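LEE-encoded effector EspG (Escherichia coli O127:H6), 351 aa
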Amino acid sequence: SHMASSWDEMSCAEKLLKVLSFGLWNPTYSRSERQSFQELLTVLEPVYPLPNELGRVSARFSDGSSLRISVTNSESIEAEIRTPDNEKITVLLESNEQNRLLQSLPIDRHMPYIQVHRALMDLTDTTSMRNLLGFTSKLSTTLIPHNAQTDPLSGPTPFSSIFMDTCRGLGNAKLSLNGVDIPANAQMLLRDALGLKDTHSSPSRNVIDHGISRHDAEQIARESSGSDNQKAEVVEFLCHPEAATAICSAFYQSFNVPALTLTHERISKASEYNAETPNACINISISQSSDGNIYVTSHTGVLIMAPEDRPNEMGMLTNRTSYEVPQGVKCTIDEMVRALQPRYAASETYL
């Protein structure tokens, strides 16, 4: 191997760390490698962060190996590597301008300018746009300040559109629960299980009080892709009221408001450049920790023109919204408004 003399003996977790140490965008990789490495990267999932952490990431690979990565507010990065035989090592990761390691993690950074990435294609094709968001959802973003005017939870009717948004979004989204992919057909089952039969529907009182029925959760998990163990985690997650809250809230259309204030002109230019446009794509990760903490990371991707410095370059604005869903918060508009405290971040990715 050109990566390491012991490459073929290394676990998925160990391989991903090596890839990131050389850099995801390393110029020596082949086309086939870039594909394989993306397949490792997509396993990364943002999860509930500890008190003084910018972010925390979990990856559970098909070979039984895993990573837990934490990033401190000073951007110190530490990883715990668990081998399939479940031995544990803790290592410090090193991010530098050569590898851009931190940029290849789903972490919200504090920066004066919006993070810019390069893709590894494009782009007016719905499938390719979804694939690009699949990638950018694993990369770093820049936190965006908001005020009373631009706060998605302000105004007279915050979250008022949430069930319509959920109804329209399920079936078209990329959705992961505890790292388990929920495919389109399973999402449609989930939509129905929430009670969202049409765009003007809202959850049943049973779902509000108890979450998805065990029967429905089992069918959804059955249609999802994972081991018998992975499906079990999904069923257990779904059968709680807070699971309904997390899933529905993740679709809120207005999470993009802070980012739009910075970018709407260039988004408009992209829409016009195409008239010479597939619309927003959605990619959501929800995880519940072993301590029971539910964390939502919801992404939307839209086409955007590069600044005038780079003429005729169209890329993707990725908006990341991150928040805990506290225990006891049921799936009603008033509950979401009362309890959810998201933060908003963005990146721009060009081909």
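Residues 257-274 form the longest helix (18 residues). The two ends are 28 Å apart (CA to CA). ok done for today
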